[PDB]
Amino acid sequence: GKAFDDGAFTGIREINLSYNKETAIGDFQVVYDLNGSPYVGQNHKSFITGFTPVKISLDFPSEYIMEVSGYTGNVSGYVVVRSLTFKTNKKTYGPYGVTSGTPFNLPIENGLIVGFKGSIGYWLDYFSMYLSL
Amino acid sequence: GKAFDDGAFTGIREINLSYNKETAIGDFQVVYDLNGSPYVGQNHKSFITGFTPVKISLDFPSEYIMEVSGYTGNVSGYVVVRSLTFKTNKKTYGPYGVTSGTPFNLPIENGLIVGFKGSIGYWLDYFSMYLSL
Amino acid sequence: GKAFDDGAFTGIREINLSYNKETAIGDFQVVYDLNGSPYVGQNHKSFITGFTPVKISLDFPSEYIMEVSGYTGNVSGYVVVRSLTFKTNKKTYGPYGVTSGTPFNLPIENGLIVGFKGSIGYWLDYFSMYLSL
């Protein structure tokens, strides 16, 4: 797929992703906070259509992500991120996608997620997160 | 004066300031690095004009500031930043302004300046620096 | 279990843990680097004995951990960390213990593990890691 790297910022204001209830995660985009102003990240798009969009609007700065979890697994033979769930200090968003395969989770006791990078083809191939105090 | 706060970024690419040989520092603006691309900072301008502009273009990422020094002193009854000197691992830029009053200097042994905040009226009233690895 | 929290240090020189093939991880102790000298961490011990000890001696500072993984599952009614594997930039240590249950993995792209906290009763119940540049 096509790789991307949004970089690191001051926080997160909104996540706009799309999913398919039979395959995996598709489109991924994020509105970060950059020293008080919204920073509209570019939309990283799947190579195919048919996904369902969801808008996760956080109440920044009092609301912030405390855990990112999901599933990675085979779809058409290769490994991709099949499901995602975002837990904040106020509520839970997801699961989105198909909860099958190998689970994973990143709970945060102290600190914040301030950036995303990864790759997207037909589906989200992989991703990493920037962490900071 | 009018307070300002640029916040923190990933580095410094260029500093554009102005000064007067008989008074003190005037305008202050920074072109920061943000995740490997330039980010044009807000231009913080004096309540007056008639200053001499200076452009300090750094050879980013290999060239970076290792020491900020200068002088604070009275001008028309109030304390202002009268002079500034920026020393990098390769060259010295300054002094700009009037080198008299009380000196100050911030040498950095490890780490980087990644942002500025302060206040500017007729002249630069005061300033602080964000430091990070 | 008894909670523990070593806090943060400069790096890791050695890890001394124990495990049992019939069950899960037991004792856990870390020899940290503190400003260039070794600092002997508290030995966090299981409520019971009979485990097999193992010493992971890293070639600090050139060798460091890049990924920690393992499995969680039920042992005699307790949900615990049944296995641990430490992968450094030089080699892999483990798996130590029993590799069955739900998997978890913490891959580090940039940064270092500089401390451990958690809880140990009959076995290693859970643990978290301090990460820093």
């Binding site: 999901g70 990143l106 990864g118 992989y126 | 410094i12 750094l58 990422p61 780490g111 | 580090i108 792209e109």
Partner: peptide
């Protein structure tokens, strides 16, 4: 070690295709 002028940040991952 010689530092560059680029600020560093901890990064965890990746999860997905290796």
């Amino acid at each position: 070690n010689e530092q560059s002028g680029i600020s560093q940040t901890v990064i965890v991952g990746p999860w997905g295709a290796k």
